[PDB]
mmCIF file of C-alpha atoms and ligand atoms in Angstrom:
data_model
loop_
_atom_site.group_PDB
_atom_site.id
_atom_site.type_symbol
_atom_site.label_atom_id
_atom_site.label_comp_id
_atom_site.label_asym_id
_atom_site.label_seq_id
_atom_site.Cartn_x
_atom_site.Cartn_y
_atom_site.Cartn_z
ATOM 1 C CA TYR A 98 7.395 -22.478 8.059
ATOM 2 C CA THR A 99 4.767 -24.555 6.220
ATOM 3 C CA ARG A 100 2.684 -21.454 6.716
ATOM 4 C CA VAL A 101 0.174 -19.856 4.377
ATOM 5 C CA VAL A 102 -0.185 -16.094 4.074
ATOM 6 C CA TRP A 103 -3.798 -15.277 3.282
ATOM 7 C CA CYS A 104 -4.717 -11.993 1.623
ATOM 8 C CA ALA A 105 -7.526 -10.090 3.259
ATOM 9 C CA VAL A 106 -9.414 -7.445 1.320
ATOM 10 C CA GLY A 107 -10.311 -4.455 3.462
ATOM 11 C CA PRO A 108 -10.035 -3.985 7.278
ATOM 12 C CA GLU A 109 -12.999 -6.236 8.082
ATOM 13 C CA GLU A 110 -11.575 -9.238 6.252
ATOM 14 C CA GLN A 111 -8.292 -8.260 7.887
ATOM 15 C CA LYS A 112 -9.779 -8.484 11.398
ATOM 16 C CA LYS A 113 -11.357 -11.844 10.599
ATOM 17 C CA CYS A 114 -8.127 -13.163 9.095
ATOM 18 C CA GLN A 115 -6.105 -12.157 12.169
ATOM 19 C CA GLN A 116 -8.664 -14.036 14.264
ATOM 20 C CA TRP A 117 -8.111 -17.093 12.081
ATOM 21 C CA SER A 118 -4.355 -16.603 12.393
ATOM 22 C CA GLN A 119 -4.474 -16.337 16.187
ATOM 23 C CA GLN A 120 -6.580 -19.514 16.295
ATOM 24 C CA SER A 121 -4.372 -21.388 13.831
ATOM 25 C CA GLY A 122 -1.182 -20.969 15.833
ATOM 26 C CA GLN A 123 -0.109 -18.820 12.918
ATOM 27 C CA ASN A 124 -0.176 -21.712 10.465
ATOM 28 C CA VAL A 125 -2.152 -19.094 8.602
ATOM 29 C CA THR A 126 -0.868 -15.554 8.662
ATOM 30 C CA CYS A 127 -2.297 -12.415 7.055
ATOM 31 C CA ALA A 128 -1.512 -9.803 4.440
ATOM 32 C CA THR A 129 -4.069 -7.114 3.622
ATOM 33 C CA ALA A 130 -4.757 -4.928 0.585
ATOM 34 C CA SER A 131 -7.512 -2.422 -0.250
ATOM 35 C CA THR A 132 -8.799 -4.266 -3.303
ATOM 36 C CA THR A 133 -9.056 -7.779 -4.650
ATOM 37 C CA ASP A 134 -6.756 -6.816 -7.561
ATOM 38 C CA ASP A 135 -4.191 -5.533 -5.085
ATOM 39 C CA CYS A 136 -4.397 -8.844 -3.251
ATOM 40 C CA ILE A 137 -3.851 -10.657 -6.544
ATOM 41 C CA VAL A 138 -0.693 -8.572 -6.998
ATOM 42 C CA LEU A 139 0.629 -9.437 -3.507
ATOM 43 C CA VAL A 140 0.151 -13.093 -4.464
ATOM 44 C CA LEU A 141 1.899 -12.592 -7.804
ATOM 45 C CA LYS A 142 4.823 -10.952 -5.978
ATOM 46 C CA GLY A 143 4.957 -13.860 -3.584
ATOM 47 C CA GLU A 144 4.121 -11.620 -0.633
ATOM 48 C CA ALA A 145 0.855 -13.526 -0.053
ATOM 49 C CA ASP A 146 -0.087 -17.106 -0.879
ATOM 50 C CA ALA A 147 -3.794 -17.106 -1.560
ATOM 51 C CA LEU A 148 -7.315 -15.731 -1.276
ATOM 52 C CA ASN A 149 -10.842 -16.862 -2.132
ATOM 53 C CA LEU A 150 -12.138 -15.196 -5.335
ATOM 54 C CA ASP A 151 -15.338 -14.657 -7.310
ATOM 55 C CA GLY A 152 -15.136 -16.069 -10.845
ATOM 56 C CA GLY A 153 -14.600 -12.625 -12.351
ATOM 57 C CA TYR A 154 -11.441 -12.321 -10.298
ATOM 58 C CA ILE A 155 -10.500 -15.929 -11.103
ATOM 59 C CA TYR A 156 -10.296 -14.760 -14.737
ATOM 60 C CA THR A 157 -8.062 -11.768 -13.900
ATOM 61 C CA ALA A 158 -5.850 -13.894 -11.639
ATOM 62 C CA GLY A 159 -5.804 -16.638 -14.258
ATOM 63 C CA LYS A 160 -4.391 -14.483 -17.064
ATOM 64 C CA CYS A 161 -1.603 -13.599 -14.655
ATOM 65 C CA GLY A 162 -0.811 -17.239 -14.004
ATOM 66 C CA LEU A 163 -2.601 -17.855 -10.702
ATOM 67 C CA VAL A 164 -4.443 -21.162 -10.368
ATOM 68 C CA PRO A 165 -7.690 -22.474 -8.811
ATOM 69 C CA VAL A 166 -6.993 -24.663 -5.755
ATOM 70 C CA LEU A 167 -10.233 -25.458 -3.929
ATOM 71 C CA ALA A 168 -13.764 -24.198 -4.537
ATOM 72 C CA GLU A 169 -16.506 -23.097 -2.150
ATOM 73 C CA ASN A 170 -19.101 -25.834 -1.794
ATOM 74 C CA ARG A 171 -22.555 -24.702 -0.672
ATOM 75 C CA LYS A 172 -25.374 -26.512 1.067
ATOM 76 C CA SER A 173 -27.246 -28.530 -1.502
ATOM 77 C CA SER A 174 -28.149 -32.083 -0.679
ATOM 78 C CA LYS A 175 -28.324 -33.613 -4.169
ATOM 79 C CA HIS A 176 -25.278 -35.695 -4.988
ATOM 80 C CA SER A 177 -26.192 -36.956 -1.520
ATOM 81 C CA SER A 178 -23.568 -39.567 -0.545
ATOM 82 C CA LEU A 179 -20.155 -37.934 -1.230
ATOM 83 C CA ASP A 180 -18.490 -35.825 1.461
ATOM 84 C CA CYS A 181 -18.684 -32.119 0.619
ATOM 85 C CA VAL A 182 -14.954 -31.939 -0.184
ATOM 86 C CA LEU A 183 -15.219 -34.545 -2.978
ATOM 87 C CA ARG A 184 -18.666 -33.424 -4.128
ATOM 88 C CA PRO A 185 -18.760 -31.610 -7.481
ATOM 89 C CA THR A 186 -19.608 -27.920 -7.064
ATOM 90 C CA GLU A 187 -22.867 -26.904 -8.768
ATOM 91 C CA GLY A 188 -22.253 -23.216 -9.405
ATOM 92 C CA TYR A 189 -24.691 -20.562 -8.226
ATOM 93 C CA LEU A 190 -27.533 -18.701 -9.914
ATOM 94 C CA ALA A 191 -26.903 -15.115 -10.947
ATOM 95 C CA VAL A 192 -30.222 -13.274 -10.716
ATOM 96 C CA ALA A 193 -31.633 -9.777 -11.247
ATOM 97 C CA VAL A 194 -33.801 -8.712 -8.316
ATOM 98 C CA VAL A 195 -36.431 -5.990 -7.918
ATOM 99 C CA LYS A 196 -39.119 -4.941 -5.435
ATOM 100 C CA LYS A 197 -42.545 -6.508 -6.078
ATOM 101 C CA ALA A 198 -44.160 -3.130 -5.358
ATOM 102 C CA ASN A 199 -42.088 -1.866 -8.279
ATOM 103 C CA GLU A 200 -44.685 -3.258 -10.683
ATOM 104 C CA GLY A 201 -44.000 -3.112 -14.403
ATOM 105 C CA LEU A 202 -40.208 -3.274 -14.053
ATOM 106 C CA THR A 203 -38.939 -6.045 -16.332
ATOM 107 C CA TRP A 204 -35.636 -6.965 -17.918
ATOM 108 C CA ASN A 205 -37.007 -5.069 -20.913
ATOM 109 C CA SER A 206 -37.489 -1.819 -18.997
ATOM 110 C CA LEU A 207 -34.152 -1.437 -17.181
ATOM 111 C CA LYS A 208 -32.698 1.403 -19.292
ATOM 112 C CA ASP A 209 -32.364 4.599 -17.224
ATOM 113 C CA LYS A 210 -33.192 2.807 -13.963
ATOM 114 C CA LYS A 211 -31.128 2.675 -10.756
ATOM 115 C CA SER A 212 -28.907 -0.405 -10.349
ATOM 116 C CA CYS A 213 -27.000 -2.144 -7.538
ATOM 117 C CA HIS A 214 -23.926 -4.269 -8.338
ATOM 118 C CA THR A 215 -21.746 -6.382 -6.051
ATOM 119 C CA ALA A 216 -18.696 -4.775 -7.701
ATOM 120 C CA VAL A 217 -17.143 -4.128 -11.073
ATOM 121 C CA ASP A 218 -15.622 -7.299 -12.554
ATOM 122 C CA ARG A 219 -17.586 -9.762 -10.403
ATOM 123 C CA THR A 220 -19.668 -12.539 -11.996
ATOM 124 C CA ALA A 221 -23.284 -12.016 -10.918
ATOM 125 C CA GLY A 222 -23.080 -8.330 -10.108
ATOM 126 C CA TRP A 223 -21.309 -7.261 -13.258
ATOM 127 C CA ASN A 224 -19.975 -9.570 -15.964
ATOM 128 C CA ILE A 225 -23.240 -11.448 -16.537
ATOM 129 C CA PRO A 226 -25.704 -8.535 -16.383
ATOM 130 C CA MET A 227 -23.535 -6.004 -18.241
ATOM 131 C CA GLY A 228 -22.481 -8.645 -20.753
ATOM 132 C CA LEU A 229 -26.160 -9.212 -21.509
ATOM 133 C CA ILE A 230 -26.941 -5.492 -21.508
ATOM 134 C CA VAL A 231 -24.059 -4.840 -23.915
ATOM 135 C CA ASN A 232 -25.062 -7.896 -25.973
ATOM 136 C CA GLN A 233 -28.666 -6.633 -26.355
ATOM 137 C CA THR A 234 -27.967 -2.891 -26.516
ATOM 138 C CA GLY A 235 -25.303 -3.266 -29.204
ATOM 139 C CA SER A 236 -23.255 -0.569 -27.456
ATOM 140 C CA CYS A 237 -20.187 -0.670 -25.172
ATOM 141 C CA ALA A 238 -21.463 2.373 -23.270
ATOM 142 C CA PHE A 239 -22.530 0.338 -20.233
ATOM 143 C CA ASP A 240 -21.743 3.405 -18.104
ATOM 144 C CA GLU A 241 -24.667 5.137 -19.779
ATOM 145 C CA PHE A 242 -27.298 2.390 -19.468
ATOM 146 C CA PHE A 243 -28.471 2.925 -15.882
ATOM 147 C CA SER A 244 -29.256 6.487 -14.763
ATOM 148 C CA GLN A 245 -27.327 5.875 -11.544
ATOM 149 C CA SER A 246 -25.716 2.838 -9.943
ATOM 150 C CA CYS A 247 -23.527 1.667 -7.111
ATOM 151 C CA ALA A 248 -20.866 -0.454 -8.781
ATOM 152 C CA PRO A 249 -17.916 -0.645 -6.334
ATOM 153 C CA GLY A 250 -14.608 -0.304 -8.131
ATOM 154 C CA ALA A 251 -15.807 2.134 -10.793
ATOM 155 C CA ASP A 252 -14.853 5.821 -10.933
ATOM 156 C CA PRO A 253 -16.111 7.488 -7.718
ATOM 157 C CA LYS A 254 -17.266 10.612 -9.603
ATOM 158 C CA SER A 255 -19.227 8.695 -12.242
ATOM 159 C CA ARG A 256 -22.906 7.759 -12.134
ATOM 160 C CA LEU A 257 -21.800 4.132 -11.727
ATOM 161 C CA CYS A 258 -20.740 5.177 -8.205
ATOM 162 C CA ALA A 259 -23.451 7.753 -7.538
ATOM 163 C CA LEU A 260 -25.527 5.340 -5.443
ATOM 164 C CA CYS A 261 -22.678 4.008 -3.303
ATOM 165 C CA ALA A 262 -22.610 5.176 0.309
ATOM 166 C CA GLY A 263 -19.058 4.652 1.533
ATOM 167 C CA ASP A 264 -18.538 3.703 5.189
ATOM 168 C CA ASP A 265 -20.136 4.982 8.386
ATOM 169 C CA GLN A 266 -18.231 8.254 7.927
ATOM 170 C CA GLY A 267 -19.112 8.613 4.254
ATOM 171 C CA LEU A 268 -15.506 7.752 3.401
ATOM 172 C CA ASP A 269 -14.348 5.149 0.870
ATOM 173 C CA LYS A 270 -17.372 5.754 -1.326
ATOM 174 C CA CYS A 271 -17.405 3.091 -4.061
ATOM 175 C CA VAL A 272 -14.354 1.196 -2.857
ATOM 176 C CA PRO A 273 -14.527 -2.479 -3.842
ATOM 177 C CA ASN A 274 -14.269 -3.865 -0.303
ATOM 178 C CA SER A 275 -16.665 -4.274 2.630
ATOM 179 C CA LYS A 276 -16.114 -0.750 3.926
ATOM 180 C CA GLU A 277 -18.511 0.260 1.148
ATOM 181 C CA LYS A 278 -22.009 -0.126 2.584
ATOM 182 C CA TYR A 279 -23.402 -1.450 -0.712
ATOM 183 C CA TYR A 280 -20.517 -3.782 -1.537
ATOM 184 C CA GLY A 281 -20.774 -7.440 -2.461
ATOM 185 C CA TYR A 282 -23.820 -9.678 -2.543
ATOM 186 C CA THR A 283 -25.343 -8.384 0.693
ATOM 187 C CA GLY A 284 -24.483 -4.733 0.116
ATOM 188 C CA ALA A 285 -25.982 -4.767 -3.362
ATOM 189 C CA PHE A 286 -29.107 -6.474 -2.045
ATOM 190 C CA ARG A 287 -29.256 -3.840 0.712
ATOM 191 C CA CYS A 288 -29.008 -1.147 -1.956
ATOM 192 C CA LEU A 289 -32.185 -2.625 -3.486
ATOM 193 C CA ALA A 290 -33.908 -3.312 -0.145
ATOM 194 C CA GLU A 291 -33.494 0.323 0.905
ATOM 195 C CA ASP A 292 -34.756 1.397 -2.527
ATOM 196 C CA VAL A 293 -31.538 3.231 -3.372
ATOM 197 C CA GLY A 294 -31.633 1.199 -6.557
ATOM 198 C CA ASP A 295 -34.396 -0.285 -8.728
ATOM 199 C CA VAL A 296 -32.575 -3.538 -9.377
ATOM 200 C CA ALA A 297 -29.825 -5.570 -7.723
ATOM 201 C CA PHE A 298 -27.587 -8.051 -9.514
ATOM 202 C CA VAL A 299 -26.730 -10.710 -6.958
ATOM 203 C CA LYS A 300 -27.213 -14.456 -6.696
ATOM 204 C CA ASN A 301 -30.272 -16.465 -5.765
ATOM 205 C CA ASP A 302 -28.881 -17.352 -2.350
ATOM 206 C CA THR A 303 -28.535 -13.642 -1.407
ATOM 207 C CA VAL A 304 -32.266 -12.942 -1.429
ATOM 208 C CA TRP A 305 -33.044 -15.937 0.803
ATOM 209 C CA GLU A 306 -30.311 -15.397 3.380
ATOM 210 C CA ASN A 307 -31.428 -11.789 3.866
ATOM 211 C CA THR A 308 -35.203 -12.197 4.133
ATOM 212 C CA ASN A 309 -37.850 -13.786 6.370
ATOM 213 C CA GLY A 310 -35.794 -13.512 9.561
ATOM 214 C CA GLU A 311 -32.660 -15.159 8.144
ATOM 215 C CA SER A 312 -30.602 -12.034 8.934
ATOM 216 C CA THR A 313 -31.484 -10.044 12.118
ATOM 217 C CA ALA A 314 -29.430 -7.180 10.665
ATOM 218 C CA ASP A 315 -31.264 -3.858 11.067
ATOM 219 C CA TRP A 316 -31.904 -3.236 7.362
ATOM 220 C CA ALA A 317 -33.005 -6.813 6.622
ATOM 221 C CA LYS A 318 -34.950 -7.829 9.771
ATOM 222 C CA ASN A 319 -38.216 -6.626 8.251
ATOM 223 C CA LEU A 320 -37.625 -7.907 4.707
ATOM 224 C CA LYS A 321 -40.089 -10.406 3.264
ATOM 225 C CA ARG A 322 -39.333 -12.759 0.365
ATOM 226 C CA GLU A 323 -42.750 -12.006 -1.150
ATOM 227 C CA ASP A 324 -41.904 -8.339 -1.645
ATOM 228 C CA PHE A 325 -39.259 -9.241 -4.212
ATOM 229 C CA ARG A 326 -39.319 -10.554 -7.731
ATOM 230 C CA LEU A 327 -36.704 -12.061 -10.013
ATOM 231 C CA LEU A 328 -36.458 -10.698 -13.583
ATOM 232 C CA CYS A 329 -36.250 -13.519 -16.130
ATOM 233 C CA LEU A 330 -34.551 -13.004 -19.464
ATOM 234 C CA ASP A 331 -37.832 -13.490 -21.338
ATOM 235 C CA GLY A 332 -39.440 -10.356 -19.889
ATOM 236 C CA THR A 333 -41.489 -11.912 -17.104
ATOM 237 C CA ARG A 334 -41.247 -11.514 -13.320
ATOM 238 C CA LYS A 335 -41.265 -14.494 -10.959
ATOM 239 C CA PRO A 336 -41.197 -15.054 -7.185
ATOM 240 C CA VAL A 337 -37.748 -15.575 -5.714
ATOM 241 C CA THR A 338 -38.547 -19.274 -5.184
ATOM 242 C CA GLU A 339 -38.403 -19.625 -8.975
ATOM 243 C CA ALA A 340 -34.680 -18.957 -9.400
ATOM 244 C CA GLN A 341 -34.119 -22.266 -11.218
ATOM 245 C CA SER A 342 -36.339 -21.063 -14.089
ATOM 246 C CA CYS A 343 -35.689 -17.333 -13.839
ATOM 247 C CA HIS A 344 -31.982 -16.480 -13.792
ATOM 248 C CA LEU A 345 -29.404 -14.755 -15.989
ATOM 249 C CA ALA A 346 -26.784 -17.535 -15.776
ATOM 250 C CA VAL A 347 -25.226 -20.062 -13.414
ATOM 251 C CA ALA A 348 -21.861 -18.879 -12.133
ATOM 252 C CA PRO A 349 -18.802 -20.958 -11.328
ATOM 253 C CA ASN A 350 -18.313 -21.144 -7.571
ATOM 254 C CA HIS A 351 -15.931 -18.729 -5.909
ATOM 255 C CA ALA A 352 -12.610 -20.471 -5.523
ATOM 256 C CA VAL A 353 -9.279 -20.202 -3.775
ATOM 257 C CA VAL A 354 -6.361 -19.242 -6.016
ATOM 258 C CA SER A 355 -2.591 -19.249 -5.472
ATOM 259 C CA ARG A 356 0.559 -19.253 -7.567
ATOM 260 C CA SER A 357 0.986 -22.593 -9.339
ATOM 261 C CA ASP A 358 4.172 -23.212 -7.425
ATOM 262 C CA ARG A 359 2.413 -22.746 -4.058
ATOM 263 C CA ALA A 360 -0.891 -24.486 -4.906
ATOM 264 C CA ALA A 361 -0.123 -27.919 -3.447
ATOM 265 C CA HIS A 362 0.966 -26.413 -0.139
ATOM 266 C CA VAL A 363 -2.029 -24.112 0.011
ATOM 267 C CA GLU A 364 -4.387 -26.998 -0.797
ATOM 268 C CA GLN A 365 -2.803 -29.054 1.999
ATOM 269 C CA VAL A 366 -2.966 -26.355 4.676
ATOM 270 C CA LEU A 367 -6.519 -25.339 3.736
ATOM 271 C CA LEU A 368 -7.925 -28.849 4.071
ATOM 272 C CA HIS A 369 -6.421 -29.057 7.541
ATOM 273 C CA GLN A 370 -7.762 -25.611 8.395
ATOM 274 C CA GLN A 371 -11.380 -26.377 7.496
ATOM 275 C CA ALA A 372 -11.226 -29.654 9.422
ATOM 276 C CA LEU A 373 -10.599 -27.280 12.324
ATOM 277 C CA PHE A 374 -12.801 -24.283 11.525
ATOM 278 C CA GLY A 375 -15.118 -25.432 8.719
ATOM 279 C CA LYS A 376 -18.831 -26.292 8.841
ATOM 280 C CA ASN A 377 -18.383 -29.350 11.079
ATOM 281 C CA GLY A 378 -14.940 -28.141 12.125
ATOM 282 C CA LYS A 379 -13.241 -29.311 15.303
ATOM 283 C CA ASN A 380 -13.268 -25.794 16.824
ATOM 284 C CA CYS A 381 -16.379 -24.278 15.232
ATOM 285 C CA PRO A 382 -18.699 -22.835 16.546
ATOM 286 C CA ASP A 383 -16.621 -22.928 19.733
ATOM 287 C CA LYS A 384 -13.313 -21.239 18.978
ATOM 288 C CA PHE A 385 -13.574 -19.946 15.421
ATOM 289 C CA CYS A 386 -15.662 -20.537 12.304
ATOM 290 C CA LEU A 387 -13.995 -19.985 8.942
ATOM 291 C CA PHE A 388 -17.190 -19.679 6.930
ATOM 292 C CA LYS A 389 -19.127 -17.449 9.312
ATOM 293 C CA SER A 390 -18.928 -13.650 9.636
ATOM 294 C CA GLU A 391 -22.440 -12.471 10.581
ATOM 295 C CA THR A 392 -23.712 -12.728 6.948
ATOM 296 C CA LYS A 393 -20.993 -10.356 5.732
ATOM 297 C CA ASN A 394 -19.203 -12.954 3.583
ATOM 298 C CA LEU A 395 -15.699 -12.096 4.804
ATOM 299 C CA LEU A 396 -12.881 -14.211 3.279
ATOM 300 C CA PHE A 397 -15.465 -16.832 2.223
ATOM 301 C CA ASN A 398 -19.206 -16.765 1.600
ATOM 302 C CA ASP A 399 -21.152 -17.502 4.774
ATOM 303 C CA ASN A 400 -23.194 -20.244 3.090
ATOM 304 C CA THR A 401 -20.036 -22.262 2.364
ATOM 305 C CA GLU A 402 -20.213 -25.812 3.760
ATOM 306 C CA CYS A 403 -16.632 -26.620 2.856
ATOM 307 C CA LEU A 404 -13.833 -26.040 0.341
ATOM 308 C CA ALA A 405 -13.858 -28.908 -2.156
ATOM 309 C CA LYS A 406 -11.105 -30.484 -4.267
ATOM 310 C CA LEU A 407 -11.558 -29.635 -7.954
ATOM 311 C CA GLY A 408 -11.140 -32.495 -10.435
ATOM 312 C CA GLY A 409 -9.601 -32.779 -13.930
ATOM 313 C CA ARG A 410 -6.915 -30.594 -12.399
ATOM 314 C CA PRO A 411 -8.632 -27.420 -13.750
ATOM 315 C CA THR A 412 -6.749 -24.686 -15.571
ATOM 316 C CA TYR A 413 -8.491 -21.419 -14.739
ATOM 317 C CA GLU A 414 -10.321 -21.486 -18.122
ATOM 318 C CA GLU A 415 -11.636 -24.995 -17.560
ATOM 319 C CA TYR A 416 -12.757 -24.024 -14.058
ATOM 320 C CA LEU A 417 -14.750 -21.025 -15.277
ATOM 321 C CA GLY A 418 -16.009 -22.938 -18.307
ATOM 322 C CA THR A 419 -15.733 -21.837 -21.951
ATOM 323 C CA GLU A 420 -19.190 -20.230 -21.993
ATOM 324 C CA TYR A 421 -18.297 -17.878 -19.141
ATOM 325 C CA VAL A 422 -14.737 -17.207 -20.337
ATOM 326 C CA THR A 423 -15.924 -16.083 -23.778
ATOM 327 C CA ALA A 424 -18.512 -13.805 -22.170
ATOM 328 C CA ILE A 425 -15.835 -11.947 -20.193
ATOM 329 C CA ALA A 426 -13.642 -11.583 -23.277
ATOM 330 C CA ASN A 427 -16.546 -10.149 -25.261
ATOM 331 C CA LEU A 428 -17.330 -7.735 -22.426
ATOM 332 C CA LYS A 429 -13.766 -6.598 -21.794
ATOM 333 C CA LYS A 430 -13.351 -5.715 -25.468
ATOM 334 C CA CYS A 431 -15.399 -2.711 -24.365
ATOM 335 C CA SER A 432 -12.675 -1.301 -22.108
ATOM 336 C CA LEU A 433 -6.972 -12.175 -24.706
ATOM 337 C CA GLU A 434 -3.208 -12.441 -24.059
ATOM 338 C CA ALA A 435 -3.066 -10.172 -21.021
ATOM 339 C CA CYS A 436 -2.724 -10.255 -17.216
ATOM 340 C CA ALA A 437 -2.985 -6.592 -16.154
ATOM 341 C CA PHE A 438 -0.162 -5.975 -13.734
HETATM 342 C C1 LIG B 47 -22.146 -11.205 -25.792
HETATM 343 O O1 LIG B 47 -21.428 -11.348 -27.049
HETATM 344 C C2 LIG B 47 -21.695 -12.553 -27.837
HETATM 345 C C3 LIG B 47 -23.027 -12.384 -28.531
HETATM 346 O O2 LIG B 47 -23.269 -13.468 -29.418
HETATM 347 C C4 LIG B 47 -21.570 -13.854 -27.016
HETATM 348 O O3 LIG B 47 -20.392 -14.577 -27.427
HETATM 349 C C5 LIG B 47 -20.598 -15.753 -28.131
HETATM 350 O O4 LIG B 47 -21.057 -16.759 -27.229
HETATM 351 C C6 LIG B 47 -21.383 -17.975 -27.920
HETATM 352 C C7 LIG B 47 -22.129 -18.868 -26.940
HETATM 353 O O5 LIG B 47 -21.276 -19.342 -25.908
HETATM 354 C C8 LIG B 47 -20.109 -18.598 -28.489
HETATM 355 O O6 LIG B 47 -20.451 -19.804 -29.208
HETATM 356 C C9 LIG B 47 -19.682 -20.935 -28.972
HETATM 357 O O7 LIG B 47 -18.930 -21.204 -30.165
HETATM 358 C C10 LIG B 47 -18.075 -22.362 -30.041
HETATM 359 C C11 LIG B 47 -17.303 -22.483 -31.340
HETATM 360 O O8 LIG B 47 -17.151 -21.218 -31.969
HETATM 361 C C12 LIG B 47 -18.911 -23.612 -29.747
HETATM 362 O O9 LIG B 47 -18.059 -24.731 -29.561
HETATM 363 C C13 LIG B 47 -19.756 -23.392 -28.493
HETATM 364 O O10 LIG B 47 -20.601 -24.513 -28.278
HETATM 365 C C14 LIG B 47 -20.599 -22.127 -28.655
HETATM 366 O O11 LIG B 47 -21.534 -22.309 -29.710
HETATM 367 C C15 LIG B 47 -19.384 -17.601 -29.422
HETATM 368 O O12 LIG B 47 -18.076 -18.106 -29.678
HETATM 369 C C16 LIG B 47 -19.288 -16.172 -28.798
HETATM 370 N N1 LIG B 47 -19.034 -15.179 -29.827
HETATM 371 C C17 LIG B 47 -17.871 -14.542 -29.912
HETATM 372 C C18 LIG B 47 -17.751 -13.514 -31.029
HETATM 373 O O13 LIG B 47 -16.920 -14.754 -29.164
HETATM 374 C C19 LIG B 47 -21.508 -13.604 -25.514
HETATM 375 O O14 LIG B 47 -21.746 -14.819 -24.817
HETATM 376 C C20 LIG B 47 -22.519 -12.530 -25.094
HETATM 377 N N2 LIG B 47 -22.401 -12.334 -23.657
HETATM 378 C C21 LIG B 47 -23.191 -12.967 -22.793
HETATM 379 C C22 LIG B 47 -22.943 -12.695 -21.316
HETATM 380 O O15 LIG B 47 -24.101 -13.724 -23.133
HETATM 381 C C1 2TN B 48 -11.145 -30.279 -21.873
HETATM 382 C C2 2TN B 48 -11.170 -31.560 -20.987
HETATM 383 C C3 2TN B 48 -12.225 -32.579 -21.397
HETATM 384 N N1 2TN B 48 -11.123 -31.072 -19.621
HETATM 385 C C4 2TN B 48 -12.299 -30.655 -18.940
HETATM 386 C C5 2TN B 48 -11.933 -30.125 -17.560
HETATM 387 O O1 2TN B 48 -10.637 -30.063 -16.939
HETATM 388 C C6 2TN B 48 -13.148 -29.510 -16.925
HETATM 389 O O2 2TN B 48 -13.216 -28.849 -15.696
HETATM 390 C C7 2TN B 48 -14.339 -28.897 -14.921
HETATM 391 C C8 2TN B 48 -14.452 -27.991 -13.803
HETATM 392 C C9 2TN B 48 -15.535 -27.786 -12.875
HETATM 393 C C10 2TN B 48 -16.713 -28.534 -12.993
HETATM 394 C C11 2TN B 48 -17.939 -28.415 -12.088
HETATM 395 C C12 2TN B 48 -18.234 -29.692 -11.343
HETATM 396 N N2 2TN B 48 -19.477 -29.984 -11.039
HETATM 397 O O3 2TN B 48 -17.271 -30.480 -11.000
HETATM 398 C C13 2TN B 48 -16.623 -29.421 -14.093
HETATM 399 C C14 2TN B 48 -15.534 -29.607 -15.014
HETATM 400 C C1 NAG B 49 -0.188 -26.169 12.549
HETATM 401 O O1 NAG B 49 0.106 -27.047 11.455
HETATM 402 C C2 NAG B 49 0.837 -28.208 11.875
HETATM 403 C C3 NAG B 49 1.338 -28.908 10.625
HETATM 404 O O2 NAG B 49 0.306 -29.665 10.006
HETATM 405 C C4 NAG B 49 -0.067 -29.072 12.746
HETATM 406 O O3 NAG B 49 0.635 -30.241 13.149
HETATM 407 C C5 NAG B 49 -0.503 -28.267 13.982
HETATM 408 O O4 NAG B 49 -1.505 -28.988 14.679
HETATM 409 C C6 NAG B 49 -1.044 -26.867 13.623
HETATM 410 N N1 NAG B 49 -1.018 -26.049 14.822
HETATM 411 C C7 NAG B 49 -2.119 -25.456 15.272
HETATM 412 C C8 NAG B 49 -1.976 -24.615 16.532
HETATM 413 O O5 NAG B 49 -3.215 -25.565 14.725
HETATM 414 FE FE1 FE B 50 -19.691 -14.231 -7.181
HETATM 415 ZN ZN1 ZN B 51 -29.823 -21.837 -16.708
HETATM 416 ZN ZN1 ZN B 52 -7.727 -29.957 -17.902
#
């Protein structure tokens, strides 16, 4: 009965979640929805207890009263001593990526180009880039900036969805879940890698994990780090090893959210679950690995070492940071006291 109902987004996260449930002796059970927003609603209704969310969704969930519980903690070895779970999270680097061979393409020449986004409302693939575009362009017409784009979650008949491919059967075009071929970090990077788009708004870690043999996936096997360039905000182009000096912003780590009244219980269960299926987990990579899904980032990002405790008992605004929270407000004025359901 001290069971947590996780919310899976899409049928792939659903399959993984059921695997995790089977392996957990049903201490973790699953609910599934077609979109992250839908999953947030199941949580709000009390039909689900939690899910891991990108910062852009943390904001949406936050206005509706959901709270940050644990955050993804990546592999970084500085802040050396502390165990991952107590280690402060460092946020990730949102970057704008292009093909090297696409010479001359700079932040300054993006208008009317083809773009690849993780999804609408996500931090690196949308809020940061479009916030900057809107900032600099003076206009709220961010649907008219790129000639065509794949921005999962936008209107399927609009140009913002024109580049999306849907699933293997061409169905679910532009849906904001993994069925969409160009969804999320990897999908958006694939959109760029296959030259469907001119630029991809992902994070620094995405380019590395999908190049120089790190993938084995058909589309990425032959990808070489040198064939890509990051677009700095000053107009220059740098190699992807220069992310620390050429990025659009550092994003708050994806984090697990739940209803305030269920947070403590979710925190508790989760810590026990990762001890079992986490990075050094008791049953991983033997029975089941929570943070692994063949580089598809299902439920959690695949580069997650562990889920770490937060700190000054973070409200959702403190977790995202004032800088980021203001940015989203300024961007969504284009579409404070809110929620949306
Ligand atoms: C797009 O819209 C505006 C363009 O200026 C940006 O919003 C502004 O962001 C600044 C920087 O974070 C905010 O300044 C802050 O002010 C408080 C006190 O007012 C201060 O304590 C902080 O240290 C900081 O200086 C400013 O409030 C905010 N402007 C408005 C009208 O809300 C926004 O960041 C731009 N979007 C992106 C993604 O850059
Ligand atoms: C307003 C007062 C001072 N509270 C600040 C507070 O609760 C801040 O929250 C946080 C959240 C997350 C992080 C990142 C980190 N490295 O721990 C740092 C600080
Ligand atoms: C389920 O959770 C309980 C409560 O903490 C724990 O004692 C038990 O080991 C877990 N069962 C399985 C099969 O993991
Ligand atoms: Fe993200
Ligand atoms: Zn920076
Ligand atoms: Zn606080």
